[PDB]
Amino acid sequence: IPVIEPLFTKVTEDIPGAEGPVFDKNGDFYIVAPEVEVNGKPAGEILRIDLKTGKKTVICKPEVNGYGGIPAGCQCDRDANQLFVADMRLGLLVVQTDGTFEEIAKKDSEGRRMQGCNDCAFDYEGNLWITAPAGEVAPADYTRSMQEKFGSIYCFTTDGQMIQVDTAFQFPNGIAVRHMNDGRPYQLIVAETPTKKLWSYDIKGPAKIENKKVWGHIPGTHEGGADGMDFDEDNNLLVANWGSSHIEVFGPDGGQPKMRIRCPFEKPSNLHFKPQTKTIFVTEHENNAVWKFEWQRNGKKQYCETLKFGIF
């Protein structure tokens, strides 16, 4: 497998568990620090990063009834400049740029208690596909599916339903949606970290997935595996292989990586393209920092880059 070694430029530092890199509708850059703790208790943060200086600003330190959150993944909304944040303790949050936030669900569409989430991905229809590797949200005692298969997948629909679409994953992590050239969502990719697998489903409609299949194989026997992911404009899937020092690049058909990207650190966690560029921002847990490097082409447009009232 060919390996490239692009130049990684430092963006910002000292962000505990640096995760969920995302750009909003105005081009502002955000990062979440899920692993910030105060007195051994969760005190996760959502930060805005000044790309010119690398200076950090904590806009939100989510907590519900005294229970601090562990914000781990993000997706920018299209119709409003707000961020949908996957939280390991609080579930799904909607965070405004002013720092205020709301907890979306304590229970799913079936009345079952919500599970802590890690990452999410918007399809072009506005439905949010979410990975939930943690156990029940606060006030329940914190648990995570790294050893046992109790991780779930949800789909938060346009009509406000939090639907559990699958279960029994050993730490479902990164998640991505593949679209047809006409914009129709048709395939969901889900990373299962410790098992070194990428799973796929056919998206038949909002909150309707079928035919679970082992889509790709993550290299290595190191502790860790696939974390965050995103598609480039040609539908190649870039996946952060936490613990391997590489970001794997899968072709449209999956299977084995067709290329690897060597990182100057062992724990790449998540990544995100800056709109209209080849620049990929990468968070990593060796130094707990954020970097950026140039990919071969532009990223696949995120839902927030599409237009509700577009014509073409």
Ligand SMILES: [Ca+2]
């Ligand atoms: Ca993650």
Ligand SMILES: [Ca+2]
């Ligand atoms: Ca991303």
